[PDB]
Amino acid sequence: IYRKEYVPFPGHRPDQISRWYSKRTVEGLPYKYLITHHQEPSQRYLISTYDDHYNRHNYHPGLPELRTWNRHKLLWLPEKADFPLLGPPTNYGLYEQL
Amino acid sequence: AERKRFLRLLQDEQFELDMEEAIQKAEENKRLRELQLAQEEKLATELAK
Amino acid sequence: MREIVHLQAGQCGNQIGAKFWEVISDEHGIDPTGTYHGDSDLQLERINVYYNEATGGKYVPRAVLVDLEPGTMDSVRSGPFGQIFRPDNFVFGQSGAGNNWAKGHYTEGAELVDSVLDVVRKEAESCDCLQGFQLTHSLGGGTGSGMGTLLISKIREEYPDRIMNTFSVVPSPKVSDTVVEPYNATLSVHQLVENTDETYCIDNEALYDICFRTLKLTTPTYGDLNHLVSATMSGVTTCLRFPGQLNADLRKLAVNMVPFPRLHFFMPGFAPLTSRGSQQYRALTVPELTQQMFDAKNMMAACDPRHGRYLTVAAVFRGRMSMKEVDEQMLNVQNKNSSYFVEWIPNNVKTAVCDIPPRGLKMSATFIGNSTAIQELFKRISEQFTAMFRRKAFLHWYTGEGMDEMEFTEAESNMNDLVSEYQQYQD
Amino acid sequence: NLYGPRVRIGNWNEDVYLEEEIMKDFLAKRDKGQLLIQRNRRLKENLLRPMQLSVSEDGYIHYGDKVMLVSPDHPETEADLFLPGDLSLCMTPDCGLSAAQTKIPVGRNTFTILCAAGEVIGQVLRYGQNFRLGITGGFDDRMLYLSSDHRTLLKSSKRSWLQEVFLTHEDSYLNCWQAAFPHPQLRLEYEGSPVPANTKILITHCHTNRGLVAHRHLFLRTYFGQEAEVAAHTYLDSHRVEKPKNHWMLVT
Amino acid sequence: MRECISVHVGQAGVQIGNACWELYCLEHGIQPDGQMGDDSFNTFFSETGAGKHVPRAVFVDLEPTVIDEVRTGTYRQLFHPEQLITGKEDAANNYARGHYTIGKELIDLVLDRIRKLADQCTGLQGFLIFHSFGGGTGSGFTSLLMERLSVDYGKKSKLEFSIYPAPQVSTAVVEPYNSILTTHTTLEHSDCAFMVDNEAIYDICRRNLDIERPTYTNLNRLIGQIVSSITASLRFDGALNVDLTEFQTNLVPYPRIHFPLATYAPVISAEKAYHEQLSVAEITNACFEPANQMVKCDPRHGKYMACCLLYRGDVVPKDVNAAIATIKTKRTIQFVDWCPTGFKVGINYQPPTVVPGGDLAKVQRAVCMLSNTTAIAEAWARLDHKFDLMYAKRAFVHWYVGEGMEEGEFSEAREDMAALEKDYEEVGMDSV
Ligand SMILES: Nc1nc2c(ncn2[C@@H]2O[C@H](COP(=O)(O)OP(=O)(O)OP(=O)(O)O)[C@@H](O)[C@H]2O)c(=O)[nH]1
Numbered sequence A: 001i002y003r004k005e006y007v008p009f010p011g012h013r014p015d016q017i018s019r020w021y022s023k024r025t026v027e028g029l030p031y032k033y034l035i036t037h038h039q040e041p042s043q044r045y046l047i048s049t050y051d052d053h054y055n056r057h058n059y060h061p062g063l064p065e066l067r068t069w070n071r072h073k074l075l076w077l078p079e080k081a082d083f084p085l086l087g088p089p090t091n092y093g094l095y096e097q098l
Numbered sequence B: 001a002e003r004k005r006f007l008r009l010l011q012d013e014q015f016e017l018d019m020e021e022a023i024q025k026a027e028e029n030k031r032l033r034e035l036q037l038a039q040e041e042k043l044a045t046e047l048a049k
Numbered sequence C: 001m002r003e004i005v006h007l008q009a010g011q012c013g014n015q016i017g018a019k020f021w022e023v024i025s026d027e028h029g030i031d032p033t034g035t036y037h038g039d040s041d042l043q044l045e046r047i048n049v050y051y052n053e054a055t056g057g058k059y060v061p062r063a064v065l066v067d068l069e070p071g072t073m074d075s076v077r078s079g080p081f082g083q084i085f086r087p088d089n090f091v092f093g094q095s096g097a098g099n100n101w102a103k104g105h106y107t108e109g110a111e112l113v114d115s116v117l118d119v120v121r122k123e124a125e126s127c128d129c130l131q132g133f134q135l136t137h138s139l140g141g142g143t144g145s146g147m148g149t150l151l152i153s154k155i156r157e158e159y160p161d162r163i164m165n166t167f168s169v170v171p172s173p174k175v176s177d178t179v180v181e182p183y184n185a186t187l188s189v190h191q192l193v194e195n196t197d198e199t200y201c202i203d204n205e206a207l208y209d210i211c212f213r214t215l216k217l218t219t220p221t222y223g224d225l226n227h228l229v230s231a232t233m234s235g236v237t238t239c240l241r242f243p244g245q246l247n248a249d250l251r252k253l254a255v256n257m258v259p260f261p262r263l264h265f266f267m268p269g270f271a272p273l274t275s276r277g278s279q280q281y282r283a284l285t286v287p288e289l290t291q292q293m294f295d296a297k298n299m300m301a302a303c304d305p306r307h308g309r310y311l312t313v314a315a316v317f318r319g320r321m322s323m324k325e326v327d328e329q330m331l332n333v334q335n336k337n338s339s340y341f342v343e344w345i346p347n348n349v350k351t352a353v354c355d356i357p358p359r360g361l362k363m364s365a366t367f368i369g370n371s372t373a374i375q376e377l378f379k380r381i382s383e384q385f386t387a388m389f390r391r392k393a394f395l396h397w398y399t400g401e402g403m404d405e406m407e408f409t410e411a412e413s414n415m416n417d418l419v420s421e422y423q424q425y426q427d
Numbered sequence D: 001n002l003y004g005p006r007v008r009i010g011n012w013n014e015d016v017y018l019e020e021e022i023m024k025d026f027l028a029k030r031d032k033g034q035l036l037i038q039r040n041r042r043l044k045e046n047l048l049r050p051m052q053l054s055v056s057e058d059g060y061i062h063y064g065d066k067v068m069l070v071s072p073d074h075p076e077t078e079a080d081l082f083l084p085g086d087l088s089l090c091m092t093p094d095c096g097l098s099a100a101q102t103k104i105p106v107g108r109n110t111f112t113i114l115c116a117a118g119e120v121i122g123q124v125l126r127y128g129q130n131f132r133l134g135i136t137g138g139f140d141d142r143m144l145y146l147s148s149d150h151r152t153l154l155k156s157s158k159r160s161w162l163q164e165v166f167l168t169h170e171d172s173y174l175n176c177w178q179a180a181f182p183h184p185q186l187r188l189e190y191e192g193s194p195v196p197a198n199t200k201i202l203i204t205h206c207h208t209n210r211g212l213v214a215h216r217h218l219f220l221r222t223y224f225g226q227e228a229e230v231a232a233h234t235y236l237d238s239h240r241v242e243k244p245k246n247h248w249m250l251v252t
Numbered sequence E: 001m002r003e004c005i006s007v008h009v010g011q012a013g014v015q016i017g018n019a020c021w022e023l024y025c026l027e028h029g030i031q032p033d034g035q036m037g038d039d040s041f042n043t044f045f046s047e048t049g050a051g052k053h054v055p056r057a058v059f060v061d062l063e064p065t066v067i068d069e070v071r072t073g074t075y076r077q078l079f080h081p082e083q084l085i086t087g088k089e090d091a092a093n094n095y096a097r098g099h100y101t102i103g104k105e106l107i108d109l110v111l112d113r114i115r116k117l118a119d120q121c122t123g124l125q126g127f128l129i130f131h132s133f134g135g136g137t138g139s140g141f142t143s144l145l146m147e148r149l150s151v152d153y154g155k156k157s158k159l160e161f162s163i164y165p166a167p168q169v170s171t172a173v174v175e176p177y178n179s180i181l182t183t184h185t186t187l188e189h190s191d192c193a194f195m196v197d198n199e200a201i202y203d204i205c206r207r208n209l210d211i212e213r214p215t216y217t218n219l220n221r222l223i224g225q226i227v228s229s230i231t232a233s234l235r236f237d238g239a240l241n242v243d244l245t246e247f248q249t250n251l252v253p254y255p256r257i258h259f260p261l262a263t264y265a266p267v268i269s270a271e272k273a274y275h276e277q278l279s280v281a282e283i284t285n286a287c288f289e290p291a292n293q294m295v296k297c298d299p300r301h302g303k304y305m306a307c308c309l310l311y312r313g314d315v316v317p318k319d320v321n322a323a324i325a326t327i328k329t330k331r332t333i334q335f336v337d338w339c340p341t342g343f344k345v346g347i348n349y350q351p352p353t354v355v356p357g358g359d360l361a362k363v364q365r366a367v368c369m370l371s372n373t374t375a376i377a378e379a380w381a382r383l384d385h386k387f388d389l390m391y392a393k394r395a396f397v398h399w400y401v402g403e404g405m406e407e408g409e410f411s412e413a414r415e416d417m418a419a420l421e422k423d424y425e426e427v428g429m430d431s432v
């Protein structure tokens, strides 16, 4: 019965795929910004307060003088509502030097 | 060796799975539905006429 | 304006710092080939905080990466970030400790400490001005709790001046993973009290809530859960790395949080969480972030914070905001319920500001709390401890490599007198 | 308790949003072309370009002749790790240089014989005389060069730690090779004879006087899967003639 | 570099290691003639200059028919010419011959090749013994080796998978003596003694796999899969891997408690697997039903002490916490007061590779519990009971006195069992 059962098997290749897929079943490799990103996708959104208020001189495409008082919500928004985000971020010449 | 197996063929094979399943679904749907519906309706109307 | 030395150990910590040393790589625009391909000249400002330099303009971290098993060190540098970590900053043995504290703290995890001690002073003396020492590990085994909390007693022998901050993982209450947890949990709590200052307590029962009840997935796992902890880390030191309105740091945080030589056990949080369906249906503004960071369901420990009081509350903020709407909503939440604060301190909530959130968020916050319902995490260990010591179970792993019963029966008299302090001030 | 993907049971809605956003991001990546498939196929098609060699009007090699570098099969029994037969010299990037089991000209094989001290673009080559070996990557259109420096304490080969051989863009004297005869009592009679095409001739450097070798004993797993090691170290036997490791043939 | 030098003692040891090393050469690319990504086959498979991997374990039998049948089988070119050790005479169902004469004549080549393996290794964790309580070579040679190795290599992990004799049914007449004597001489030099039976696997191979009239060769692969999902943590990667020290430090509370029970959960055939739904909950509730133990004992007469859930395959790690949480809310599963944690989980992701054309199917989630229970003292009660009936007549004792060992071992081998069951009764009570 030993010589019965222990006939060799050429071609029972083990799989490599279910282990590799359970790895990302646990991990989830590109998933780690799909967990905490919010609102609308955006690559460059970020700028600082000294550079916006002082050196920048503030928002450009907005209303320069008009602050219009709206109907339903009781508010003078078109200055406050922008919260300026114009243009490129704070660049001042350090990537050049380094 | 672990970096070579787990970085350069892993992602290639997974993206090839998803590309091939999209192509298989599209080709199967268009070919089977167009051929079967067109041939059946046309020869049914010819026989009845 | 300092650098940060950050220690990692255990089978845990190199699967947590693997997510930590890649959010810092995300926020400074660090590609995994070593160089910098960010967009501004703001990110390049305080790159020194986390990234030493070499030739060619590449930045390699200050990473300390230690474990007895070579099981997980084959997995951290086989990630996407494998050429960003340092080659000679992997220190290991060959054997594995595995759930005992004798051969972590005295023999088998111990002969490699002189191979962690003489890698720190290679780098932590080459840093020009350090703020202190960080650590992340699990108390639940034998390489974090065996080597790191041994080394926490060792590196505080040299420098008492700096500040110890910790990212600890206490064992979960309900379903545990090892039969010998309330020894390794017991003995390292009595370790932690004398030599650590802001000790942060993290659980996995409290995080398998958040990826289920809050963010609404159906398969929460470790990689989904390691990143919310690794969101907290870069959300802590936001002002030593970026400008803002009111900058804070790890010495500003300790003054406004811990009053006492012994009342120094904490509890963390992280504010802006939602699902993937309601991504555009929410408005990420201040009346939404403040509404949930104080809630019990958005908390990373085994605390029902209503059952006790917060003696003190910290915070931080990020993002281009205004200050009046963060001046009154932490003034309303101190006012609307005086039941959940103690009366003898006049203020509780500290406010800190930055200018930039993590990449993808719009505005952010990170809740840090010294509540006295954190003593409901150290009552179940002392309930589990002496209901094991009474039958003297498993003690021949604990006499067999150099410890006594006198390292045992005094390792609960620290846990008793801790809770004997936190109950004085409960009402 | 738990069902499949599409049936409207349980927590399906948030997951429907989840694979909707992941499926759309994956389609955006495929449309832009930032996927590993199309980048890798474009790279490998620009490497494995089926291109044509130059036949020789006689037995001899001239300059400017697009000539493969190949090493013959050996019956040697020095060790029991072995690559089967006729290895060739191929650019293996990550660039690097190694030896692969191939025999067709495929564009990372194809070397142009160039002149270092010689002048004419067609000129007969002789033993003991300097020349250069040129190869070009796809769309770069700039001549690479076969190089190897005197050994230092930081510049060693990958698996073996001998003198290493690599490819570089620059021009120097650490790029010039010279080819001699293996039978050691006849090379001083062969110092000026023209070199026939497919004959077994040693290759040596001119600055180090070491020689290019093929290690059939240690393997380099690549993307292409074909394996060997190249270096430069002259080998001799107990009878002090050159081993079959060092024989090279420049086939057309 | 985390090898496991294993020992196979006796007719039982070689006949189970045939299927065990069948699975170890099956799951890799290992041909049955030495030849042949992952390099975790160097923990059981050495190299040479021809790629030829030769297994690092020792097979002993003094009764050389099984070893010569291996040497002439299909597995000749793979095993070493020397780590297969024969005699020309068997111990033949006695403790005296195996422990004093036939053990003493040939223990030295065993210890030689163990020292050669142990100094050609670099990273051995411990020693794993597969042996037989109820015979001659698997008991006397076993205890002689487990004295002669624990005197040399000292404190190291020792786990014993033991082919224990059956509760009611039997094969040889005088198994109580040769069980009791080797148990008394193993208890002082064990660390963890995993226990299996034969009719208790016949029952499951009838009632689960639906194959009727099976053999030893159809029983052997279930142990050959049990040992593989035991050792799987070194064998492949995972989320929470297991070294060899955590069984031995998580499973035994005391000096003389160490007798756990083994069980293996997802047992089903090919025609039924595709229509049953392999849920984590249904697997872990099958693994606690007393119709699914490898040892014929009923756990309802006593209390558990410590468990070890060792997973394999596509674990969903939230669902394991949910499964343990719904186990813990039952009164039909009882526990002692002093272990309030009472669990351990180990993880690996590789699915179980199953032999071609076997009695089992391609399961995707394997569970092994190696838990200890105080309802194995009931099993020890019967082999003290049989000894009490037999020694009073002084039956069979001349075979024992006529090869060197005295009759005065027979009183102490019962006093030892009485004190062991005293220990098992005093540990499982409540304190108030
Ligand atoms: N189920 C099962 N039982 C086995 C197997 N091999 C041996 N046994 C059991 O082993 C018990 C003792 O028989 P042996 O193994 O021949 O005895 P021994 O330990 O080798 O001692 P000696 O025969 O004197 O050399 C028998 O009751 C068998 O039931 C096996 O492969 N499967």
Ligand SMILES: Nc1nc2c(ncn2[C@@H]2O[C@H](COP(=O)(O)OP(=O)(O)O)[C@@H](O)[C@H]2O)c(=O)[nH]1
Pocket: C009, C010, C011, C012, C013, C015, C016, C097, C098, C099, C138, C139, C140, C141, C142, C143, C144, C145, C146, C169, C177, C204, C221, C222, C223, C225, C226
């Ligand atoms: N959420 C989460 N938990 C982890 C991670 N790694 C480890 N753990 C927990 O940490 C514990 C393992 O600690 P252990 O390996 O024994 O500690 P060590 O001996 O110091 O390495 C287990 O209970 C895990 O649940 C991780 O990456 N994420």
Ligand SMILES: [Mg+2]
Pocket: E011, E063, E090, E091, E092, E135, E136, E137
């Ligand atoms: Mg026998």
